[model samples]
Target chain A: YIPDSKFYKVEAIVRPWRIQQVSSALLKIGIRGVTVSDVRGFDKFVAKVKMEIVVKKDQVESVINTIIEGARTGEIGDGKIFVLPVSDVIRVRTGERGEKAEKMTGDM
Target chain B: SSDYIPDSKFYKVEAIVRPWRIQQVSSALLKIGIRGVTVSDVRGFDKFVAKVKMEIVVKKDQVESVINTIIEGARTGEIGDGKIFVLPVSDVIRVRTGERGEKA
Candidate 1:
C-alpha cells in the first residue's frame, strides 16, 4: 500500500464478441484484473461490454495499446476506450493503496 | 462525421449503495427526471460489503441534484452506507444512431 504511487482507471466499451480476446491481451500486457459488465450505448439498440481496469500510472499507455490492438477490427463498431485519473484505490483484504492495491491479486 | 465532436462538459456520478436501497434510489432518480442511468452489481471493500453501483452521466449542471437524490434515497443513517464518486466525462456517444452530445 504505497501512498505516493499514482493510478489510472481505464474504461473500454467494446463489442461483446471481442471481450475474450481483449481479456487475454490485457493479461499478456501484465494487467492483473478487470471488471466487466454488459452495457448498452451509442444508439437505440447497441449492446456493448464495458471493461474497467485500474493500474499504475506508468502502465497506462501499455494497457491502452493492448486494448486497442486486441479489440480493433477496423470496423465502425469496434468500440471506444476512456482513460481517467484515479485519486486513490484501496484493496479490501490487504488494505493496500494505489499500485499495490491493483497488484493485490499477485498477477500484475 | 462522427469522430470529431468537441469534448462536452459532463459528469459521471457513480454511487455504490446498499443493495436493498437500489429500488428507492432508482425511483428517486426517475422522479427527478434523470433517465440516463446504468446499474451494475459491484463488490466493494470499504466496509467489506457487496453493493449496487449506479452510474449516471448528466450535464455539468445536474451533478449535484443527482448525487443528492442518490444519497437521500440510499442513506439509512448507519454503517456500510457506501460512497459516491463524481468524475468528468469527456464525451458520450449513442452507437446506434451515431448521435453525439447530450442527445446521445
Candidate 2:
C-alpha cells in the first residue's frame, strides 16, 4: 500500500556488481537523487546493493523499469523491488522540502 | 502528500544512526524478534560525518515499538543522534520464492 502522496521511494536490492550500471541508468533518467548502500539480508549470506530512489509518484514505474534493465542478468535474479509512499523530501543543508529538495540540480 | 500514518500492513523504518550506536540498536531490535534488516555505511554529505543507515520492515502494530527501540538504542545527548523515516510499503516479494504480501 502506497498511501496518497506526491512522491514514492523505489527501493531495490540488486546484485552488487550491477549497482553501478543501474545507478548510472537512473541518473540518465533524471533521477540523480538516490542513496545507495551495500547491504546483506535474508537467508544465508549474499551481498546486495540497496538503492533508495525518491521520485515523483508519476516516475515510480520508470525508475523501476530502469532498475530491471540494468540489474537483470538473464532469467534468474535474486532481488526484489518495493515501492513505498514518501510523504516529503527534506534537505539537510537548507531545510528545504518537497519537490525542490527531491530534484537533483546540475542535470541537463 | 499526506503525513505518515501507520496505515499500511508493513512499514520500513529507515534510521540514519550514529555509527557507534548501531550495535546496540541491532541487538535491541533482535531481542524483539525483528530480524530482517538491511544496514550500510553512509556519510553525511553536509559534513562527511559517518552515519549508518539501518532499514527494517515491520507490521503496522509493531511500528511504534520498533521506533521506540531505535530511539532507546541510538539516543545520545548529542548532535548526531540521527533521524528516522517511516514510509508506507505497499508489498514485499521474496526473490527466491515467488511469495507476496505478508507471506513474503
Candidate 3:
C-alpha cells in the first residue's frame, strides 16, 4: 500500500547554478516526479537552502542523498532538504489509485 | 511587470493555483498563445483544498510571459490559492514519437 504521499515533492534551492543537476539527478535516481522553484530569503528562518522532494517513503532516503550529493556544489547555499507529508495522489487521467499510479516508479 | 529570461536550459513553470480558476487559467493560456501544457489536481500544505497544478514548458524567452499570465489569472488573495516555480528541464521527451519536447 503506497502511503497517501504518492506525489513525492523534492525541493532544493542550491547554488542557483546547481539546481538543474538536482532535478535531473533526481529523475535519474528513479525520481522523475519533481517540482522546483527558485526561492530567496532568510526571513522567518526560512533558510536559503530549502528543498522538499515528495516521493514514496520507501525511496525517500535515496532521493534525498542523491540531491545532497548531486546538487551539492560544496558551498553554503548548496541547499537543505525538507520531507513533506502528502495527503493523497490522484492520477491526472482516470484518477487511478494505488498500483496504477505507483507504476510510474517502475522500480517498485 | 517586465518579461525576463532565466538564461538556463529549458525554463519550467509550475503553478499550483485555485482549482475553480482552471478553466479561466486554460482560457488565459489560449488567449496568450501559450500551448503545450499539462494540468493535474494537486494538494498542498495547510490542508487547503482546491489545488490544481498547471505546468508550462517554454523556452528561456517566453517563460516570463506565461508566469505573468498565470499570476494574473490564478490569484485569489488567500493562502493556498497557489504558488509558482520556475526551473530548468534538463531533458524533455515526447512519449509518443520519442522527440524531445522543446516546449510541452
Candidate 4:
C-alpha cells in the first residue's frame, strides 16, 4: 500500500498542535505528497519535546520553514527539523513507483 | 524508598497510530495535564497509510503517565500504528526564552 521511490526523509521536531498547520502549508506549497512519522528523541536544549513529523522528498524546506514560521508560536521546544537523502521508495501493494506511488496522494 | 523523580526532564515518546486517531491521542494527552506533544504524518514497513510518529517531552517521572494516556487513547491496533521511545535528559533551553529546564 505504501509507495516506493519517494526518496527523501524530512523530519521536524515540532509541537503536536502545530502539525496541522505545517501539513496544510506543505500541501499548499505545491508539495505533492509525503510520508510522516512520529519520532521521539533527545536534544540537549529541549529534552522532552515531541518530534511530530517526518516527510519524504521533494519539498524539504517548505515543510521545515512552515514549522518554523507557524509552529513555534514564540515558545521553546518548538523542536528541530532534519532532512535525509533517500535511496529507494517502494510501494507495498503493487510494488510501484513514480506515477503509481505518487497516485496515492491523488491526481493533484 | 522514594521512586526517582527526574527534574523537568525530557521524555521523548514516539508512536504510530491510525492517522484518524491522531487527534484523539493528542487530545487525550492534553486532558491528562500534558499540554505539549507532537504528531507527524509518517510511513512504515507494511501499510500505505503507514504509521505516525508521536513524540512528547515530559518530566521523567511522568513518562508512564503520558505513555499510558497515549496508548489508551491512540490504540487502533493496526499495522501503521508503530512505537514509542523514552530517552534521558541532561539540559534543555528554550531558544527564545534562553531558559534552561526549570529556569525556562
Estimate, for each residue in A1-108, the C-alpha lDDT of model 2 and write its tens digit: 356778888788878888778878987887776777778664244578888888888887778778777787754556777778877889887889997798776444
Clashes of 4: 28
User: What fraction of the genuine interface contacts, i.e. the true contacts, does candidate 1 reproduce?
Assistant: 0.01
- Number of the predicted model whose lDDT against the real structure is largest: 2
> Against the true structure, whose TM-score is highest?
2
| Model 4 Cα lDDT, one tens digit per residue, B1-64 | 1133233244456666776677677778878877645555576553565566676656567788
TM-score of structure candidate 4: 0.47
Worst 10 residues of 4 chain A by lDDT: A41-50
Q: Which stretches of candidate 3 lie over 4 Å from their true place?
A: A1-108, B1-7, B101-104
The stretch of ten residues in a row with the least summed lDDT in candidate 3 chain B is: B90-99
TM-score of chain B of each: 0.85, 0.88, 0.78, 0.77
Alpha-carbon runs more than 4 Å astray in model 2 = A5-7, A20-36, A40-46, A53-79, A86-108, B1-6, B45-47
- Number of residue pairs clashing in candidate 2, backbone atoms closer than 3 angstroms, sequence gap of 3 or more or interchain: 1
Using DockQ as the yardstick, the better of models 1 and 2 is 2
Q: Rank the candidate models, highest DockQ first.
A: 2, 1, 4, 3
Residue range B1-37, candidate 2, lDDT tens digits? 3335646777889999998887788889888888766
lDDT of 3 by residue, B1-104 (tens): 32333234455688888878777766787889985455556665546565777766676678777888888788878776778887554334332222333532
Writing each residue's lDDT as its tens digit, candidate 3 over A11-105 gives 44455555567767877877665555534332022223334555665776577677766665544444444333344655676788654665344
> Rank order by lDDT, top first?
2, 1, 3, 4
Let me know the DockQ for model 4.
Answer: 0.06
